[PDB]
C-alpha cells in the first residue's frame, strides 16, 4: 500500500546547558546547575580560571 | 586627598601578551581596581569575529568538499579562531581564494585596506589535490561578549558561525609595593593580559575604565 | 484515493513553503525549525498531512532519500 517514502535527515548541534548530565569515569555523576560567566569562575594567581 | 593612579608602563611581552602598570595606588584600591578591571576586560571588551561563511559549492557544514583535508564543520571551527582587526567599519566581507596543494591559511585571504590579519599563519584548511580550489566569503562583524549562532535571528549555503567577539583571553593582576618619592604606603597594580592580538592593551585598559566610570555615574548621584 | 506528495498544499502561505522544491521536498542544507514542512503531502479526504519538523527540533537538512515502488512515476526531486 505504500506509494513512496521520503526520508529526511536532520542534523542538530546540542550545546551544553543546565539540566544536562555530566560524569567522570569514577562514578562521579551530576547535573549542570549553572553556566557561570568566565569572570565569575574561581581563578589562580596567573588569572587562569577553572 | 587620594592619589590618582596613572598608566606608567606597558610591557608588550609578545603580540598577544602585555603588562600594564598603574601607579600609584592607595591601600585597598589596588585590589579593587584590579578585580573591577579584570571583570570588565573579561566580559565587555569589543572585538571582531567571524559570523557568516559562504564556501562555493557547499550547502551545509555537515558535508565534505573534494580535495579538502578538513570537514566543512572543522573549517568553520578554524574560521571561528581567526583573529582580525577591522578599522573604520563594524562589518566587512573578506574573500579567500586558494588553489593547489598546501595549507590554506589566513595569509591567503584577499588583502583589505581596513582589515588587519594579526596571525597570518592561522591555518584555515588544507588542500590535498592539485586541481582542488577553495573560494569563500567570510563575514566579520564587530561586537562584544559571546553570541551563539542559534540565538542569532538566509540563502542555503550561508553557514552561521558562533561569534566569540571578546579579544581578551586571560586577565591576571598583581598588587605590589610601589616606590614613591616620599610615600611608602603606595602600591602599584600590574595587569597581565593575554589577548588575540586585535586590541591594544592601553586601549583595553582605558575602555574598561570608561565602562566602569559610566556605570558609576548612576551611583555618583544617587536618586 | 492515492496520497500525493507535492508542493501544492492548502491553507498554508507561500513563505512557509519556500524551503520546499517544485516536488514539495525540502532542499538539502535548509535550516528548518519546529513546525516547518519537510515533505508536503495531501490526502484526498485534500487534507494537510505534510511531514513537519517536530516541535523544538530546529536543525539542518543534510540528506534526502526517495523510495518509489514499481509502477509509480517518481517525482522531479526523485
CATH superfamily of the domain at 46-164 in chain B: DNA-directed RNA polymerase, insert domain
Number of H/I helices of chain B:
3
The outline of chain A comes out as elongated
What is the rounded Rg of chain B? 22 Å
PDB class: transcription/dna/rna
Keywords: ppGpp, DNA repair
Entry title: CryoEM structure of E.coli transcription elongation complex bound to ppGpp
Chains A, C: DNA-directed RNA polymerase subunit beta
In short:
Chain A has no helices and three strands. Chain A has 50 residues and is mainly β.
Any overview of this molecule?
This is part of a larger assembly, with 2 copies of chain A and 1 copy of chain B (223 residues). By secondary structure, chain A is an all-beta fold. In chain A, strand 2 (21-23) and strand 3 form a beta hairpin. Chain A has strands spanning 4-11, 21-23, 29-31. Chain A has a two-stranded antiparallel ribbon with strand order 2-3. Chain B has a domain at 46-164: DNA-directed RNA polymerase, insert domain (RNA Polymerase Alpha Subunit, Chain A, domain 2, Beta Complex). Chain B has 3 helices and 14 strands. In chain B, the strands form 5 sheets. In chain B, strands 1-2-14-13 form a 4-stranded antiparallel sheet, with helices on one face. In chain B, strands 5-9-3-11 form a 4-stranded antiparallel sheet, with helices on one face. Chain B has a two-stranded antiparallel ribbon with strand order 4-7. Chain A binds chain C through residues 2-12, and chain C through 2-3, 5, 25-26, 32, 38-39, 51, 53, 57-69, 72, 74, 78. Chain C: It comes from Escherichia coli (strain K12).
Keywords:
part of a larger assembly, 3 chains, A: mainly beta, two-stranded antiparallel ribbon, B: 223 residues, RNA Polymerase Alpha Subunit, Chain A, domain 2, transcription/dna/rna, Transcription elongation
List the helices and strands and how they pair.
This is part of a larger assembly, with 2 copies of chain A and 1 copy of chain B (223 residues).
Chain A: E1 4-11, E2 21-23, E3 29-31
Antiparallel strand pairs in A: 2-3
Chain B: E1 6-12, E2 17-25, H1 29-44, E3 46-55, H2 72-80, E4 84-86, E5 91-99, E6 102-105, E7 115-117, E8 123-127, E9 133-144, E10 146-147, E11 158-160, E12 163-164, E13 168-177, E14 187-195, H3 201-220
Antiparallel strand pairs in B: 1-2, 2-14, 3-9, 3-11, 4-7, 5-9, 6-8, 10-12, 13-14
Catalytic activity (chain B): RNA(n) + a ribonucleoside 5'-triphosphate = RNA(n+1) + diphosphate
Enzyme class (chain B): transferase
Family (chain B): Belongs to the RNA polymerase alpha chain family.
Amino acid at each position: 500500500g505504500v506509494l513512496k517514502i521520503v526520508k529526511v535527515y536532520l542534523a542538530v548541534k546540542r550545546r551544553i546547558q543546565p539540566g544536562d548530565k555530566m560524569a567522570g569515569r569514577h562514578g562521579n555523576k551530576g547535573v549542570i546547575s549553572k553556566i557561570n560567566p568566565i569572570e565569575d569562575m574561581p581563578y589562580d594567581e596567573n588569572g587562569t580560571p577553572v | 586627598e587620594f592619589l590618582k593612579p596613572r598608566l606608567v608602563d606597558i610591557e608588550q611581552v609578545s603580540s598577544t601578551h602585555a603588562k600594564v602598570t598603574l601607579e600609584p595606588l592607595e591601600r585597598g584600591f589596588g585590589h579593587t581596581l584590579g578585580n573591577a578591571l579584570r571583570r570588565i576586560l573579561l566580559s565587555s571588551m569589543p572585538g571582531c569575529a567571524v559570523t557568516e561563511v559562504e564556501i562555493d559549492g557547499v550547502l551545509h557544514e555537515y558535508s565534505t568538499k573534494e580535495g579538502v583535508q578538513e570537514d566543512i564543520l572543522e573549517i568553520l571551527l578554524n574560521l571561528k579562531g581567526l583573529a582580525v582587526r577591522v578599522q573604520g567599519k563594524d562589518e566587512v566581507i573578506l574573500t579567500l581564494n586558494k588553489s593547489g596543494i598546501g595549507p590554506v591559511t589566513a595569509a591567503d585571504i584577499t588583502h583589505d585596506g581596513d582589515v588587519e590579519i594579526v596571525k597570518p599563519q592561522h591555518v584555515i584548511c588544507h588542500l590535498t589535490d592539485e586541481n582542488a580550489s577553495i573560494s569563500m566569503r567570510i563575514k566579520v562583524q564587530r561586537g562584544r561578549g559571546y553570541v551563539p549562532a542559534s540565538t542569532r535571528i538566509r540563502p542555503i549555503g550561508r553557514l552561521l558561525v558562533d561569534a566569540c567577539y571578546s579579544p581578551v583571553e586571560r586577565i591576571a593582576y598583581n598588587v605590589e609595593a610601589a616606590r614613591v618619592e616620599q610615600r611608602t604606603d603606595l602600591d602599584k597594580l600590574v595587569i597581565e593580559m593575554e589577548t588575540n592580538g586585535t586590541i591594544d592593551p592601553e586601549e583595553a585598559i582605558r575602555r574598561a575604565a570608561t565602562i566602569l566610570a559610566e556605570q558609576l555615574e548612576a551611583f555618583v548621584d544617587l536618586r | 484515493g492515492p496520497e500525493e506528495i507535492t508542493a501544492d498544499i492548502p491553507n498554508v502561505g507561500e513563505a512557509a513553503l519556500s524551503k520546499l522544491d517544485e516536488s514539495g521536498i525540502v532542499y538539502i542544507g535548509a535550516e528548518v525549525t519546529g513546525g516547518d514542512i519537510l515533505v508536503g503531502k495531501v490526502t484526498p479526504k485534500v487534507k494537510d498531512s505534510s511531514l513537519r519538523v517536530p516541535n523544538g527540533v530546529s536543525g539542518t537538512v543534510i540528506d534526502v532519500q526517495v523510495f518509489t515502488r514499481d509502477g509509480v512515476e517518481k517525482d522531479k526531486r526523485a
